[PDB]
Design a binder for this molecule. Structure first.
Ligand SMILES: CNc1nc(N[C@@H]2CCc3c(C#N)cccc32)cc(-c2cccc(N3CCCC3)c2)n1
Length: 337
């Protein structure tokens, strides 16, 4: 028992499968988005209550909390737009067109220092081996500054993450390639083939000596940031960590969700990792170079596949989100020792 479970509560206001759910930087609000384009913003401590609800007319593909203005949420659409939404005013402050032929805003990342953000913008899917771009913006003006060239070719980027001080951005794409960007020189510092198939999520280790990825080949991999494509470790996760996520009845009728949101998340110092399963969140201890990966805690509580997760740590206490295909989000409260 590395954690004690103080409680599990359910947020049930969504009526469709969850696409993303993310805790804001204060650690006190959730923004969640379902596949019907319903955005919800809610607190959970001490109880769940909804602060904002809106239906998007246009498809929404991505979501990212601002780092230096807690109340602001970036939203990426399926029609080439990025919206700045103010969660206290309950209104879109602006909506900026990506003057391009790439309508799918697959990923948004806000710089730690709050001065910039990046988005991926991809062509329509045909599978997702399609052109995409990586855009850098200025938050103050909400104008694009530049686009990063992608080698060997433009490609849809599924995931982005900054490091702690924001001078590095790691990315994973539909070609299975990880591209790491120096955000000072604005160039690719490093890239390598990471997965057979798409990369779904990427993150810096706490110590920033490695990055972690998860992709379509079922694998969780740790990579040495000081030596391109040198694996540190590699685990085959259970299938239901990476999907595709399937809900059936007897009928011939199924719902299929391909990974879109974050497939893993971490505790404050990155000693533990939360992942999806059919039945709820599954948490593993990192750091080992053991053969099998040490599965230590199962959060449970889901009657439909979990398809995205989050983990925030605030007031010396852990908040885990697990989100399932029935629209249900479980918030599990953890304390360490
Ligand atoms: C608070 N309002 C606001 N903030 C802006 N930038 C913030 C600063 C910090 C931050 C972070 C972080 N961390 C992330 C994303 C955005 C931002 C920019 C604008 C803006 C920019 C252009 C046009 C318009 N409008 C509106 C009235 C007619 C046109 C408004 N508004």
């Amino acid at each position: 028992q590395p954690f004690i479970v103080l409680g599990q509560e359910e947020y049930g206001e969504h009526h469709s499968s969850i696409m993303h759910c993310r805790v804001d930087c204060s650690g006190r609000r959730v923004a969640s988005l379902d596949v019907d384009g319903v955005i919800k913003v809610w607190s959970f401590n001490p109880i769940m209550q909804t602060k904002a609800s809106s239906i998007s007319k246009s498809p929404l593909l991505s979501l990212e909390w601002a780092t230096k203005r807690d109340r602001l949420l970036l939203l990426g659409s399926g029609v080439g737009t990025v919206r700045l939404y103010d969660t206290e005013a309950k209104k879109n402050l602006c909506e900026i067109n990506i003057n391009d032929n790439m309508p799918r805003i697959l990923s948004l990342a806000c710089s730690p220092n709050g001065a910039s953000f990046v988005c991926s913008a991809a062509a329509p899917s045909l599978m997702n081996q399609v052109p995409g771009r990586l855009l850098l913006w200025d938050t103050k003006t909400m104008k694009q500054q530049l686009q990063f060239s992608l080698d060997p070719e433009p490609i849809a980027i599924n995931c982005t993450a900054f490091n702690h001080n924001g001078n590095l951005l790691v990315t994973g794409a539909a070609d299975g390639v990880i591209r790491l960007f120096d955000m000072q020189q604005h160039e690719c510092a490093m890239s390598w083939r990471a997965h057979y198939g798409e990369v779904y999520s990427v993150e810096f280790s706490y110590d920033e000596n490695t990055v972690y990825s998860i992709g379509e080949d079922g694998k969780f991999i740790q990579w040495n940031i000081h030596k391109s494509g040198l694996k540190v470790s590699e685990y085959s996760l259970p299938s239901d960590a990476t999907g595709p996520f399937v809900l059936s009845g007897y009928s011939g009728y199924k719902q299929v969700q391909v990974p879109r949101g974050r497939l893993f998340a971490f505790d404050s110092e990155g000693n533990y990792m939360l992942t999806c399963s059919a039945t709820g969140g599954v948490i593993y201890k990192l750091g080992g170079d053991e053969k099998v990966l040490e599965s230590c805690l199962s959060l449970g509580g889901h009657r439909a596949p979990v398809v995205t997760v989050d983990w925030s740590t605030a007031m010396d206490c852990g908040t885990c989100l697990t989100a399932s295909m029935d629209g249900k989000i479980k918030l599990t409260t953890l304390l360490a020792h």
